[PDB]
Design a protein around this ligand. Sequence first.
Ligand code: SF4
Ligand code: SF4
Ligand SMILES: [S]
Lengths: 399, 373
Amino acid sequence: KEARVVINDLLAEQYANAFKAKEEGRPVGWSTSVFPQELAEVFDLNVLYPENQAAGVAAKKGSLELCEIAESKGYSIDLCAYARTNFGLLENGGCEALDMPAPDFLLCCNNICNQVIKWYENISRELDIPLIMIDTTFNNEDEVTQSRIDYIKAQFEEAIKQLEIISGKKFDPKKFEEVMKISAENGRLWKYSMSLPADSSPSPMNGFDLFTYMAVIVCARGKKETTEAFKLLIEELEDNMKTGKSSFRGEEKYRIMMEGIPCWPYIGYKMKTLAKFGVNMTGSVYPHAWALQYEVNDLDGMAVAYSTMFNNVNLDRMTKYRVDSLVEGKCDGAFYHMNRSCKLMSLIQYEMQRRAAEETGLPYAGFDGDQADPRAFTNAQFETRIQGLVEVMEERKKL
Amino acid sequence: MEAILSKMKEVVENPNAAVKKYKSETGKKAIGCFPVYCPEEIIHAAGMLPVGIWGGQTELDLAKQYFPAFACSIMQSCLEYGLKGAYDELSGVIIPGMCDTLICLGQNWKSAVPHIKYISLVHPQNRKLEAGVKYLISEYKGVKRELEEICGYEIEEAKIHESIEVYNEHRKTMRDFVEVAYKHSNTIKPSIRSLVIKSGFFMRKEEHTELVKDLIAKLNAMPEEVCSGKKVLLTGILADSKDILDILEDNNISVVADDLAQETRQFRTDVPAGDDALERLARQWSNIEGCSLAYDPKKKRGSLIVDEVKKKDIDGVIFCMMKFCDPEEYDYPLVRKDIEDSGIPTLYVEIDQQTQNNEQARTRIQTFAEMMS
Ligand code: SF4
Ligand code: SF4
Ligand SMILES: [S]
């Protein structure tokens, strides 16, 4: 029984089940990627993820057509490409490469960014469906203020109220505790499995593999099927570590941290190019994104966990995340994706990479791109950029 | 009019002079307020001067160390000015995290301009929940605590109430101005309308109230006017550049209403009444409507623009789109459709504070006036 196969089947099952619910008159939701999924899972609701779908279509080279449809309706090319792909999808009545049913309700949390607020405002208005908002206000202070904790808990309560109406069911505290226990263990398995590259030379996997498995923890964090999927993946990874094997091909000459999400329309090319130079991503911040740890029935801790996702903490803490990933990852360099869609990450990248370089003493380089819009990435430039980083790292190896 | 217009012209064109003048005469400090909404009443209560920060016509150089090319124009200008020390006479600045770019600017600011205290403030999206109101009160208490550390003395509750009354009086007066400007659209050119409104950002509100009430008196003395050209409503972040305002007038266009963050968005919603001063302010945010930065799944912005158009028989709506403003960009398609579904023509014009060439706006506005017949 192969992990990659179980995982692919599981992901396809989520889409299939949502289509079946649609046919039978049960409500389907669309959700941001770090929303408190526990709440809707208590009601056994089918929830899909527009970011996951856009990344999927982009990898199949189908995002450009959808973006162009959105732009013809008047959406500026400046907006996030996940949003443009999604608006194109709605206008087109779906797509061929990776279809999913329209939503009956929306779940929005701005811990990742504030663009999702405006994005979901538009869907709510145009489809006339309820919008559930969990506003995690940005943390300037090192710690989450009590005021933020209280306000998030109050929004948990409003969310449950609206979900009871949507589902036609009453909140079940007994099923809720069961959901919190499953979600906690899956968070732990995500952080453990994806952190294995750090203390393993060479690493048991190609670094890009993380972004495939990411789809699982995003869309099924509260499912027991996810528990078994990750346990099987862990068995395979640990087996590699013991026999010096990996899905990465060739000699692991250099270890790096890549800042940002991959350019999905070019994922295959990026994998070939790094591997050709003997470069592997062994340090990452993403193992921490969906760890989301809190004690059972502790709503205070759950609020803190969702509030402190690394896109929503001060620049000192953001920087510490990258520094710790490089050091603990035993990395020789850092490689930065200036992602045209993601303003939150892009507008503090200059200061963050200066600090990370000063503290670690490690060299860095970067390239321009986008996670879903193929017009923003240039193959020839990506190649020369990593070649330059490799030359610096090679010279520094000499004693 | 000239005595009043010239006074407003001196503070708008020499903002820094006005600040240094205020600090020496009162012996009090000044605090900068970034867009879009700050609780100015708290600063005012301390006896300090709330000064509006809205960028300006500048080229980029120093800002390139912190922002790539695709941050919005206005925030690029604000950062460049800060780095050049144009704000150094301020004892602090409130930079509300209303969007990703405002949030990033604040974080960069702590390093880029370490000698000017940055005071944090994040308004709640869920602003109509009682929990949202209670949260925003806590944020305002934080803002109060920081201001008190700066000025050196406590800000009394009774003083905040007085400030709130002063500001509501100002908002009423500005709305009175809008109506009298609409009834004399030939005398009050677009460049004049903008000057009267923008002037409020560089002087105490009670002092600006007296200036505008003096201008209203003088206009009412004059007879109402029948607009000789076309009327429009302007909507967007701002439209205060000399160049854009000159083009409007050259095509025989008068602005008689706006949904601009820098203008009417500031005074169309009053602060509610109440025993608790910080509670009053917080409930004002509950009541804001028709703004791209104010959460509303129903997006009433379009319908509200239509109402104003019909009240004043306006001939067209011009979207003054800030370059790379994602909130306004998300709004554009749905708001445009609401307006055009009511038989009102619209125009798209880009606003770029880094340009030395506004030929696109010149030819588009030319074609838009001819299209108006
Ligand atoms: S890519 Fe950046 S801007 Fe687009 S949705 Fe994800 S976090 Fe928000
Ligand atoms: S609201 Fe628009 S113009 Fe204002 S800071 Fe945010 S992106 Fe820039
Ligand atoms: S703004």
